Amino acid sequence: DVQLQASGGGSVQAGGSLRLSCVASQNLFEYYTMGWYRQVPGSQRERVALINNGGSNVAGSVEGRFTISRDNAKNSIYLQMNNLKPEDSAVYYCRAFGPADYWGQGTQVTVSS
């Protein structure tokens, strides 16, 4: 089955930066939409950004700080964060979307004041 494995999470200080990378076991990014979502502890997942061949979108709560970028040849998606705040701490999931929906297993991201 299709598998999405995220990486790059950890703990950082306020105002810092982090790089998340999610890799797929097959070549699937060309026919699917890739999305980054965050799950605050005790809250439903919300969208962080989506990307396709035609461009990208970034949510207003994270707009101006977070950016979503795709790399088809390496079969990976990369999210670049800067000026991280303690409110950004959550479990980040990389979602493959299209004919079928596949959910990443999540990565823990923590930001401390």
Binding site: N53, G54, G60, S61
Partner: protein
């Protein structure tokens, strides 16, 4: 008589469409390629583009860019398959030019500081005329009928359909207020917006900037651009409009007519006679056809392509013999008793 042909294209507008190859990657370029047609003989190619040419302006392209119409002189543009091309004429969404062979076609221009360039892998195949397979047009030779595109833009029996322009989203128009979601349409045109931020809301602000409550992030709203006039060609990159999907059809320029073309003429072979025998020495400059046939009920027809000098011996009987060398006229011969 030119202006009556030209006027009918004043009912359309240029537009963008996706080209897979940019100067970097895949874009929605303003000079997208709808299709390429090449069926003439001298390599003259007609090309279908997403921009307009001549708009009563002599030599200039009119194109669209993020909803803004711009125009540039035609000498600012270049194109090539592998070797540089040469422009000839243009009209409407079509451009007739002189190009060499190649499996792909690239075309490109330079803005004040931005180079737009798109390429597509559509075969561009040269079609020689006659029995000599030359490559590039020669200088001289005998004159024959040929089929070639039309340099003029006369209206003939070929019509293509157009439709209403579509409603494409403009991310720039949707923006942020101090506390609401802003929609500020360009003053002088109607626009519509669809949002699901609250319930299910759709509204058509008309010439009045509208702030929207209940919507926090601009991602929850989409504003689309409206235009009643300026009909559009039956494309596939552009979404269709509402109501009958059709408003009319219009002539096409640069059709395939009949002209007069010169063809290369090969040298004279060297003949040699003999008793029921004919030897020939051959020295082709280029690949050329020899077509030989007996004048009897049974042909033994021999069609061959010669590209190197050579010697060949055949037999000719009292019943006759025929051969045609390249573009030269037919040669008949008859044997006798010696």
């Amino acid at each position: 008589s030119t202006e009556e042909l030209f006027n009918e294209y004043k009912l359309t507008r240029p537009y963008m469409a996706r080209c897979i190859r940019c100067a970097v990657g895949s874009c929605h370029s303003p000079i997208a390629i709808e299709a390429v047609k090449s069926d003439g003989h001298d390599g003259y190619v007609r090309l279908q583009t997403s921009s307009q040419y001549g708009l009563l302006k002599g030599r200039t392209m009119r194109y669209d860019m993020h909803g803004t119409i711009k125009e540039i002189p035609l000498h600012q543009v270049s194109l090539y398959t592998s070797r540089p091309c040469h422009i000839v004429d243009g009209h409407g969404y079509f451009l007739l030019a002189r190009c060499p062979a190649g499996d792909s076609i690239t075309m490109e221009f330079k803005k004040d500081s931005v180079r737009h360039s798109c390429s597509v892998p559509y075969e561009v195949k040269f079609n020689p005329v006659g029995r000599e397979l030359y490559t590039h047009p020669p200088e001289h030779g005998v004159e024959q009928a040929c089929q070639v595109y039309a340099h003029d833009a006369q209206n003939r029996g070929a019509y293509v359909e157009m439709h209403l322009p579509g409603s494409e989203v403009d991310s720039s128009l949707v923006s942020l207020s101090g506390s609401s979601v802003t929609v500020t349409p360009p003053d002088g045109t109607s626009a519509l917006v669809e949002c699901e931020c609250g319930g299910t809301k759709i509204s058509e602000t008309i010439n009045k900037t509208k702030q929207f409550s209940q919507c926090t992030k601009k991602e929850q709203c989409r504003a689309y651009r409206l235009q009643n006039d300026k009909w559009v060609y039956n494309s596939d990159k552009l979404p269709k409009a509402a109501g009958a999907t059709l408003k009319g059809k219009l002539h096409v320029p640069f059709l395939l007519a009949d002209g007069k073309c010169t063809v290369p003429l090969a040298p004279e072979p060297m003949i040699t006679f003999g008793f029921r025998s004919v030897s020939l020495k051959l020295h082709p400059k280029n690949p050329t056809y020899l077509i030989t046939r007996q004048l009897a009920d049974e042909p033994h027809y021999t069609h061959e392509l010669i590209s190197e000098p050579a010697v060949r011996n055949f037999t000719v009987t009292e019943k006759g013999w025929e051969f045609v060398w390249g573009n030269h006229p037919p040669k008949r011969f008859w044997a006798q008793e010696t």
